[PDB]
Every structure is written in C-alpha cells, then in structure tokens.
Amino acid sequence: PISPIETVPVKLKPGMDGPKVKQWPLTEEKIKALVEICTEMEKEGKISKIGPENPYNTPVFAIKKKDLVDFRELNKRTQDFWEVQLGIPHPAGLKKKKSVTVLDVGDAYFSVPLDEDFRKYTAFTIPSINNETPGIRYQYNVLPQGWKGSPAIFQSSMTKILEPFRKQNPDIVIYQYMDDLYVGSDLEIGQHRTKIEELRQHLLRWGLTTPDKKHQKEPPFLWMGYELHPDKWTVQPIVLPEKDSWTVNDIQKLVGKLNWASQIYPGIKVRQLCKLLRGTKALTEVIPLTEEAELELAENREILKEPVHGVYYDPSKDLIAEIQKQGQGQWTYQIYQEPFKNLKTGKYARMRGAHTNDVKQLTEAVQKITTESIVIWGKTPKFKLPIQKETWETWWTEYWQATWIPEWEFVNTPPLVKLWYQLEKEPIVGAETFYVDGAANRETKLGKAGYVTNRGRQKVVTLTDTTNQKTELQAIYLALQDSGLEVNIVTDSQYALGIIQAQPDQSESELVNQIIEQLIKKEKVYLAWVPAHK
Amino acid sequence: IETVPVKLKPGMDGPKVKQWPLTEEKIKALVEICTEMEKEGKISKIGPENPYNTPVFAIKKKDSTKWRKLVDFRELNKRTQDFGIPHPAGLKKKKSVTVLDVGDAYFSVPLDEDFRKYTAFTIPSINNETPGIRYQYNVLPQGWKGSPAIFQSSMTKILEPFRKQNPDIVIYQYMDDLYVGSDLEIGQHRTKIEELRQHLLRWGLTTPELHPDKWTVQPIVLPEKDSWTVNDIQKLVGKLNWASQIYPGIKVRQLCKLLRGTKALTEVIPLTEEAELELAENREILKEPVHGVYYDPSKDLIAEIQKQGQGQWTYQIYQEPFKNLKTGKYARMRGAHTNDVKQLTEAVQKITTESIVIWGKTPKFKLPIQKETWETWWTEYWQATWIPEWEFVNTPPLVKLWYQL
Ligand SMILES: Cc1cc(C)cc(S(=O)(=O)c2cccc(N)c2C#N)c1
Q1: Chain B residue at shortest CA distance from A150
Q2: A235, A315, A352, A446: which is deepest, by most CB within 10 A?
Q3: CATH number of the structural domain B210-295
Q4: Which CATH number is associated with domain B90-106+148-209?
Q5: Which residue has a Cα nearest atom 10 of ligand 1?
C-alpha cells in the first residue's frame, strides 16, 4: 500500500548524470525469479516499466533468501542529506516506563513516494536468456531498498506523520531508529495497548502498515550493548571462548571484546595479553599463551561472570560523578543519582604523551565526562574527586594554561592524586649551586654534560650517540644525582625549564622520568634559567 | 520588499558545521524562541534535502535574564562574498562610548530565496531521543556579515537626523552593534543616548559606558634594589636579553660581566659603575614603545593572551611579532574568583571590543587553553553578538615574565 505524503525534492550531485552500467545476464532460475518478483511489486504500483527513453541502468541481482538492486553508482551520483544518525540515545539517558513496545514498521520504505523527477535514475534491467532483443525494464516510484536517500527521506516523512499524534498524546514516547519504532509510556498495559492501536491505525491511515499485537516484539529490548527493561537495564553478560590454540588475529579480537568490557567491569586487565602480540609475523600465527596470560585470561572469566544491572534517569534528582585512579594515566568513573544505583560507568587510559601530571590528567577526565553528560542528560554532574582542595588550589592558580573544574567535592578515596614535587620560588640559602651545561655534536651525536658548583665540586661526562637535548637534561640529571637534599641549579636550556615547570610526574622520555624521580627525592629544589652563549 | 541577491564567494559551498551539544535549560530557550520566530515568519522548518548547518546557542545579558539566541556564522561569513560601511578614527579619542544592540532591525528585511538554504541550523535533542529541529532564515540573520551591509541604506536614513543635529557625536556600526561616542559629560551623553534610542524605537528597531584612549599602553618597568644578588641579576639579564628583540639598543654585557664566576645565587653583588650606566641607559629605552610600528589595514590583527595567575592576564595586539600596536594587563572581574574560563572569555571580549573601536576589526586569538576545555564552556559566559577567530597555544615562559612588567 502506497501513501499520500508530499515527496521530498531530490537531485543528483552538482553536474553529474544518472548511472549507466550493464546487466549481468543470469541462469534460467535467477531470471525466472526476478520476472515473478518484479511482476509482483509491478502490480502493487511500487515500480513501473520503462521504455528506451531512459539511458540509465543499475545491476539487478537475485539471491535466494534462506531460512536485490545494486545502486552503488547511483548513490555516488546523488546529493548529500543531513544526518541519518546524530547520535544514539544511551540507556543511562532514558527514564523508566510502565509499558514499552517496539513496532516493526519494517517495509514502510516502500510506502513512501520517491520524487517523480528522480525516478528515472532508478532504471534497472531484467536480461534475456539468449539475449534476444529487449530486456524487461523498470524504475522505482517509491523509496528504493539500498538507495542513499531512502533512510533520510523515510525519517522525515515519518516525523511529519508523527507530529500530530505526538501532539495529541504528549505523555507518550516514540523513538524511531531504522525500521523500528520504540514506544514507551506510563499507562497501565490496557491503556497503553489502546493508544498503540490508535497510533497503529493512525499510521495505517497514511499507507504505513504495521504488525498486530500478535506479531510484535516484546521486552527485554536488546539495545546494542544492553538488555532493556522498563525499570532497569542490564549488561547482557559476556562470553569468552575457551580454547586450545591461539592465533594472533584471535588475541586481537579477544583484547577487543575485553577492552569494551573494562568500561562496565573495571578490574579487567589485558596487559599480559597484549604482550602475546609483540613481534607477531602473521595474523594467523599461533601463540603460546604465557602462564601470566593464563592467570589473566581466567581471572577475567570470573569478572565477566557477574552480570551488571542498572538504573534509568530520574530528572527530579541530582547527578553525581565520582572518579578514581587505577594506575598512572588510568581513571575509572561511575555516575549515579542514589549511591550504588548506577546510571553509567567507564574508564580512560592516557598515553603519557610528551609530559603530563596527574592533576592535569584528572582535569581531562572531568572534562570528558562533563561533555558526554551534557549530551545524555543535558546537564552536568557535581563531582566527587580524590584530590584535596588545597592540592588543586596550589596547582591551578600557578599553571600557565587556563583550567577549571566545575562544582566538585573532595572524597577521601585513596590513592589521592597529589603533587609529587614543587620547585622553590626563589633560591635556597645554604645550598650548593650547580651551574650545569650540556652540548652534543648534532652530526656525530657526541656529547659532554657536566657542572661546577660554588662549593668547588665538578664532574663532566662524555656521551656517545646522544643529542641536542638529552645532553642538556643529562646535565641536570647529574646535578640532581650528586646534590643532596637541597640544590640550586642554573641552566640555559629553555626546553629543560619550560618542561620542569609543568612539574611533570610522567613523560614519554625515559630520561625525563629519571629526573622526575630524582626531583621527587630532593627536599628543596630551585631551578633557574639564564640566557645561553654569553 | 525587493531582495538584493547575495552569493557565495566563487567555488565555495555552504557550511556543514556540526552542532555542539547544548544543555537542557538552553535547549528549551531556543525551542521557545524559535517556534515563535516561525509564527512571525522569520524562519521556516526545512527538510533533509538540505545538507548545510551552522551551530546555535543561547546567551544572557544583565537586567536581561531573558535568553537571547546566538548563531555561529563565522564559517558562512567567511564564504560570503564581499561588499560599504567605513571606519572613523574618532571614537578612538572620544571621552565615552556606548554600545547598542541593533540586530533586531535586520529581521524586518527579507533574504534572497536561493541564499536562504545556506542559513540552515539545528536545535538538538537531549540524548538524541528526537531528530533535530531544522530551520532556515527567511529574513536577514543576526551576526551574519551581509546583514549590516544590506540594511546599510535604511540605517543611514534612520540616523541622519540624530547625525546632522549632533555632528559632535560619532556613530559606528559593527554588525549587530552601534557604538555611540561623545566627549559630552555623562549627563548629556546618557540623556542624548536615551534620546537616540527613542529615535530608533520610533522606527521600531529597539535598543537596550566605555572610555577610549584611557586605554594607554603599559610601560615595562625594571625592578630596583638597594642590593642585588646573583639571582636578581640573572633574572634581570634574561629579561633584557629577551627584550632586546623589541629595543635593539638594550645592552647586557656590563651586567653579564658581574655574573662571571660560579657564585651562589644568594651571593650579593655590587654593581660596577659601568653596569650602573648600562642599566640606567636601559631603563630609558624602555620608557617608550618602540618606533616604527604602524597599523596596516591589509593584514590580520593578532591578539596574544598570557595567564599571569592571581587573576592577572596580559596581552598584546600586533600584526608582526614584537611590533605591538597595543599591549595590556587585565585583572579578573569581581566574582570569577575561582574559574579561568570565565575570566579568559571576559578578557577575550574587552580586547575584541577595543580592537573594534580602534581599527573596527576583530583580532585572531591565540589562547593559553586546551581546545577541549574552551569548547566546553566558552558559551556559558559569552555575551557579544560577534565571535572572533581563535587558535590554542603553549605560552613561551619568557614572553610571560617580560609582560609581567
Ligand atoms: C527514546 C527511546 C529509545 C529507545 C532505544 C527505546 C525507548 S522505549 O520507550 O521503547 C524504552 C524501552 C525500554 C526501557 C525504557 N526506559 C524506554 C524508555 N523511555 C525510547
């Protein structure tokens, strides 16, 4: 059954012309079929025969669906539309319901009228056995299965059509995704069922047929990742294939499933599992699962045993966000309204990169979270952070970059994030003063790094295969090594200081880490910078 | 009326910029604001056959808690052909200036039918439970660059009388705003302003204090001690050495001499008479902005900002590095005592304003803040009808101690 809705004007990309590809004559069986099938929709008005005044053609195929037109070219030539998927609603962003139902609005694609003008580009051909003279030609008069515009156009159509019902019944929740129609409400079944029918007949009044309550899917609803109930969502537990031999590609997919799991079941680990990848020569090469890997792979089966259940969003309450540090650059967080009744949860791993610190990092977490919150709940969480207000104050007021943390509150959940060290703001009286300097031949990679102090001390070192920076830093490393609890170190390096300012407590550079460790050791350090080469 | 045809710069296509997730409170605000403009016929809902999009959001002013809708046409303005409004160097000197919001005026005038498509924008839904609400302008959009242009004529007329009967007053139009400056003491200024409002209110474009050239560039003062330590000198020399990029006459050898010898930082040092002269001579060169810096209209204006901490912020507008057309400091607004973004945005605003006043042109910003952080909260505190360009950087440690002066 067709429909009476204004068609959406559709045109081909700027200056291109309809598809022009050949038909792949088929078996006696693959042609007989498409002759029947097409005679069907033919009678239903969906497609109409065309003559020679249409120069286009798309490849028609015939696959026996057990237990098809190729528009690839056409699509390329068709204009672009807006967004056929802004973002998927996330479970934690939905509010509970009394009754729920999804209708398979299915083949409504073929109920929506395709722009008449455009129809001509949709021309396809049913070949001949012995390639007689003609072939049986057709074109579409309705949204085609597999065409670029189909979803988009169907999407809108559906929306206009649903605006009034939405109006009449403002306490009802209709959500359209693909060819489904999730509907929720707080009416008791009976009242619910009625409205559904109402609605149902309402669509049907436009040509869009729908399944009887008889053939209609029911809760739990499986929503990409979750098992949906009207009062609770659940983490459809996960399966890990126990097996004899492991191929690389396998481990990959394994660590894949696992990495997605860690968001819900923190504790999950794969550090010893990623190691099985080192050096892998072929995606199909089998690997000897190490004993440490055995102990990990199993400890994970235990974790993923216990399913996870959750709660939906209650507007009348506050959103609470709590964070924890699992290790260096690893943060876990969970969002809830009522303690232990989680709405959502997750974790972030931060590849150290150039030079960061925990506070800076903590800061990035908060930020990320804040953004996804806004997307889901339209508002942002109050935060419970493992950091002392004093610690934060000290750091932020003094960092060279603009930064901020929304209303938050300290939660004493060790291990707290703190500042491993702070450089003195001014020189230390009664402290050795090391004038450090380093230099290396860019070309030869040959260097010397050393120092001299106000207390007579000195040392220098020759470095083979070093560089334009390592030397400088090393200079300071030495200075730090041989100094004792209180030091004053003057250098001319910009790279050195600039960095140490940020008070990094983690770096990509192994060297840097050396210094950091050293710095943390000292009781009081003062670093000063003087122009070079004078 | 008969609409003037507008076109995109050749080769260019409409903007397809993504919408940033908006918070709850402001979604409604927009939806509310929009269902109404639709009635009034300003905008019309569009379909999917339209692939363009621009970001939108809502802000609020003082005594005006009521939400105001704002659109980011930066990309579009960039792709919109050029046209036609001149800049006077008058208000640069005025004793006072007042800014007026004259965006409304535009909604009266229609926009060419085939350009309308490009103005498509979207009202997003929380948790994407609904598709967006696509609209498109039928009238002249606010904050768009073609708008103050097309409304030029009518504007000129409308003002001419207040103009001709008060040639002692300057009137500058920069997009949705109008800058009104007079040397007349506050009494007659404010009153004359209000009078001007009415003059406009009379036609129907509704309109709801600054102090130019009070904005003098800041000096770079060098510390003074009775006694100088090795450290003191070190810091001093570094400062100058760097500063010699602006003033080539600054010299640092005499001081650099006293620093020879591996001595303690705390160690106290007496200035040789030659170092005393050198220094004194340097203090002089710094008493005035470098010579030879002249604003070039054909080149972009640039503004750098540095976080000095304690609520302090310094900046420099320049076109060529080290040849600042103006420089300054800024102390946080009473009440932003806990957040940088708040401050930083306020700052960005004041500066853009002065830029406008002075050269009737906005500066491109280099911001000491991570893009993520900026993009997440800048809207929460914005309050201008325009949006300047910006990029994000890593403040060199030096340029920072220098301006600390
Ligand atoms: C907007 C939206 C998206 C999806 C996927 C499903 C629905 S629903 O109304 O069918 C629904 C199913 C199960 C539990 C819920 N609490 C809701 C609710 N509400 C709504």
Answers
A1: B48
A2: A235
A3: 3.30.70.270
A4: 3.30.70.270
A5: A182
